[PDB]
Write a protein that binds this ligand. Sequence first.
Ligand SMILES: [Fe+3]
Ligand SMILES: [Mg+2]
Lengths: 198, 212
Amino acid sequence: TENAAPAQAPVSDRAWALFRALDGKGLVPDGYVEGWKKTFEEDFSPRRGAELVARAWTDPEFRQLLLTDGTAAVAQYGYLGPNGEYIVAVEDTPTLKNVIVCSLCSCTAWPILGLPPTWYKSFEYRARVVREPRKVLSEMGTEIASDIEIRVYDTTAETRYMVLPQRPAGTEGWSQEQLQEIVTKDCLIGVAIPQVPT
Amino acid sequence: MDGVHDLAGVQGFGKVPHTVNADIGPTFHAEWEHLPYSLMFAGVAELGAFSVDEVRYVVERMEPRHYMMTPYYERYVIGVATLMVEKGILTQDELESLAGGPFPLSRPSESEGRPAPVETTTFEVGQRVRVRDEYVPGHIRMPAYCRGRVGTISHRTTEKWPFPDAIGHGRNDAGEEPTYHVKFAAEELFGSDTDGGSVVVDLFEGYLEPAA
Ligand SMILES: [Fe+3]
Ligand SMILES: [Mg+2]
């Protein structure tokens, strides 16, 4: 019928066929995809971006490096990598809330945010956050007052971004470990604000 | 390419399927889902058969309805498979034989791409620029919402990269250009029909011109 989907074998069968077609020709090194799977699951992680935020919150000199040469700051920690070679950190302020998207696909600072979540790659987010970020954030559980400008960064080239969120009050004197725990993946993407227990 | 993948600003979608900090489950939600990225890297770094930009473009070349009903990671399975057939590494027949059934691919390209522009300008932070009012049928890393619109430079990258409109087609004339963080007021892009403040697009030098 009109506008019907094309016939397709099960996606798992098609993905593994792609693998076997290449692997059987000797074109895929031993353990090559298993190795990437492990990198993607274990190494690329928003815990790294949380470490960077907590360091910036407690070290003015690192904060300044992260905001002026994010690549350099990240390299100090050894966290450069694929889709994370040219890093720019964008600073939230009392009058500015930053949010990151890839409207054309899914582009994300993989090594310090982790691979993007399903929702970030959704057509709903890709279409809507550029045009109505306040309503999207609100729907997602984050209210941004009218006194704050919202700035959406569309990741359309090689720059890979992370948000440096505002440090919330009630965290004075906390350790880096304590601060890291309240910086989540969504805070690094920009759709959430770090929360402290009461 | 003015394909359905250029979604920013489309109206009619519903709620984003997420609440902040909700559980997003494991990195991969099926045992095959690591294969499209891993095999993309195999193609780029081990085979040298294509560029990352060619992967973005072959996904843009999915038949439009096919794109719209296909989950993200499956689009990259289809894309990488398509490039392997186009580059002569695999055949569709062996893919369908192995898969036990149909394996439709992206559509052939209808553009040969274009070279890195011969004439561009090095812009400075604070300068006003216009996005070139150009229509590119092949790959381009300019979302249509900003075509022809004016914004201000907040950053010029200190690194340079091959022009997507060339390297996305495997051309030898992609050269290298820096990109620019261009800040647009929301009202510049969507008039009164936005609730935002500003949008920053990371635009190759060859997409820009002085705003006068
Ligand atoms: Fe993307
Ligand atoms: Mg339209």
